[PDB]
Design a protein around this ligand. Structure first.
Ligand SMILES: [Zn+2]
Length: 425
C-alpha cells in the first residue's frame, strides 16, 4: 500500500483539506502558502523556508562570509511552479522509497504515532493541546481551522544544503528533550545531493577526493526523519552534548565538535563514541521524562476542546509512549517497554541501518569531510526509482553502485561546487 495515496500536482486546485493554503501559527506574519497533506499527520510545503526562523527570512547569497565552507546559495531555487511540482513529486518518491523497506515502514509508523504531547494546560486536572504543534488551514469558506500535525517537509532556507529537523520553541519547556515532542519541520531538498569518496582514508581527509559517488537522497531524507522521530518523542540529545572529536587529526586541527545526537542518528560505529555511562544517563533522563508524562496524564480528568474525547487522547498517548494502565486506570511506565521503544527510536532507526535496506553505497561515518554538491532530478523513472534509486536494474547502472557513480552515470549529476580544500585543515 503506498504511503502517499495521491500523486499531487502542484497546480491541483485547493480543496481546504489535503490541498490548502496554510499558515504556520508562530512563524509570525506570513502570507498563506500552498501545502499538500501527503499522509495522516504529514504535510509538504514546496517553498523555501523563510518562516521557521525570524532571522532567516531571506535567501540572498552574499558575504556574511563563506562560512561552514560547506554551503550553497541560489536565491531563485524553488521559486517557480514547475520547480514546486517537481519538489512535491521528488519528496513523494523518497517517502515511497523509504516506506517500501521494513525499516522505513517502522520509522514512518513511529512518526505518525508520535503525536506531540498535550502538555499545554496550566491546570493539572485538564488535558490541553500545545498550539505550536498545529497549522492553520484555510477552509473553502475562507476561514481558518487549526489542524494538529507531526511533520512538515519544507524547502531549505538561504543555504540550500543545510538540511535540519527544527521546531517551534516553548517559553518554558524543551519540547524535543522532555518526552513531549513537537511538530517537526524538516528543511530538505530532493533536487540536490552530496558527493562522497569510496575509500575511507580519502573520505575522512579534507584535502582529497572530488566526490565520485553520490549519496542517495532517500538516505538523506531518512536521516532527517530519524532526527524528527527523536524530537517527536522528546528524546533528542541536547546539541550541547558533543564528542570533541579526537579520532581524526583534521577534525582536531579545527577543534570540530559533533553532537551526540548526530552520532546516534548515524549509528554503526559512530554511536559507540557515546560511552556506556553517558548512554545510561540519557536513558535514565528520558525514562524520567516519560514518567512525568504518565503522572501528568493521571492528574487530568477533563479534556479541553471539542476535537477528541479525553479517553481518545489518553489512549493516543498510552499508545505513543507504550504506557501501562492499572486496574484503577492509573498510567505507569513499564521499564522493559521504555527500553524497547527508546532503543527502537535510537538504535534501530539509524542511517547505517537504512543503507543496509536500500543496498546503496554511502559514507561509512558521519566523521568525514564533504566533497561536492550535485544538481539531480530523481522524478523521471529513467533516472531514479522507488525500488532501485539510481542503481536501475537491468541496465549498466545495476551493478557496483554504478548509478551512484557520478563519473559513470554522469548525465544524472551536475557538479555545482567543490568543497575539498576549502576546509581550514
Ligand atoms: Zn543529522
Amino acid at each position: 500500500m503506498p504511503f502517499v495515496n495521491k500523486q499531487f500536482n502542484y497546480k491541483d486546485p485547493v480543496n481546504g483539506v489535503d490541498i490548502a493554503y496554510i499558515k504556520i501559527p508562530n512563524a509570525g506574519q506570513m502570507q498563506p502558502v500552498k501545502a499538500f497533506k501527503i499522509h495522516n499527520k504529514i504535510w509538504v510545503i514546496p517553498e523555501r523556508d523563510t518562516f521557521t526562523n525570524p532571522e532567516e527570512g531571506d535567501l540572498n547569497p552574499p558575504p556574511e562570509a563563506k562560512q561552514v565552507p560547506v554551503s550553497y546559495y541560489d536565491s531563485t531555487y524553488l521559486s517557480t511552479d514547475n520547480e514546486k511540482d517537481n519538489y512535491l513529486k521528488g519528496v513523494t518518491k523518497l517517502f515511497e522509497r523509504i516506506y517500501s523497506t521494513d525499516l522505513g515502514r517502522m520509522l514512518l509508523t513511529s512518526i505518525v504515532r508520535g503525536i506531540p504531547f498535550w502538555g499545554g494546560s496550566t491546570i493539572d486536572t485538564e488535558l490541553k493541546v500545545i498550539d505550536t504543534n498545529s497549522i492553520n488551514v484555510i477552509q473553502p469558506d475562507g476561514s481558518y481551522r487549526s489542524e494538529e500535525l507531526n511533520l512538515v517537509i519544507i524547502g531549505p532556507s538561504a543555504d540550500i544544503i543545510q538540511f535540519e529537523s527544527k521546531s517551534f520553541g516553548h517559553e518554558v519547556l524543551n519540547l524535543t528533550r522532555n518526552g513531549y515532542g513537537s511538530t517537526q519541520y524538516i528543511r530538505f531538498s530532493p533536487d540536490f545531493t552530496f558527493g562522497f569518496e569510496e575509500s575511507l582514508e580519502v573520505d575522512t581527509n579534507p584535502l582529497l577526493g572530488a566526490g565520485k559517488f553520490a549519496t542517495d537522497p532517500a538516505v538523506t531524507l531518512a536521516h532527517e526523519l530519524i532526527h524528527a522521530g527523536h524530537r517527536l518523542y522528546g528524546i533528542a540529545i541536547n546539541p550541547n552534548r558533543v564528542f570533541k572529536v579526537n579520532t581524526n587529526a583534521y577534525y582536531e586541527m579545527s577543534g570540530l565538535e559533533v553532537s551526540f545526537e548526530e552520532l546516534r542518528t548515524f549509528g554503526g560505529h559512530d554511536a559507540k563514541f557515546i560511552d556506556s555511562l553517558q548512554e545510561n544517563e540519557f536513558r535514565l533522563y528520558y525514562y524520567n521524562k516519560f514518567k512525568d508524562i504518565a503522572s501528568t496524564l493521571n492528574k487530568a480528568k477533563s479534556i479541553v476542546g471539542t476535537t477528541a474525547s479525553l479517553q481518545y487522547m489518553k489512549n493516543v498517548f498510552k499508545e505513543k509512549y507504550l504506557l501501562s494502565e492499572d486496574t484503577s486506570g492509573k498510567f505507569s511506565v513499564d521499564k522493559l517497554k521504555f527500553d524497547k521503544l527508546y532503543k527502537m527510536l535510537t538504535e534501530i532507526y539509524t542511517e547505517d541501518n537504512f543503507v543496509k535496506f536500500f543496498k546503496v553505497l554511502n559514507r561509512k561515518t558521519y566523521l568525514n569531510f564533504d566533497k561536492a554538491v550535485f544538481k539531480i532530478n530523481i522524478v523521471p523513472k529513467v533516472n531514479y526509482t522507488i525500488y532501485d534509486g539510481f542503481n536501475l536494474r537491468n541496465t549498466n547502472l545495476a551493478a557496483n553502485f554504478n548509478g551512484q557513480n557520478t563519473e559513470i552515470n554522469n548525465m544524472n549529476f551536475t557538479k555545482l561546487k567543490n568543497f575539498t580544500g576549502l576546509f581550514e585543515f
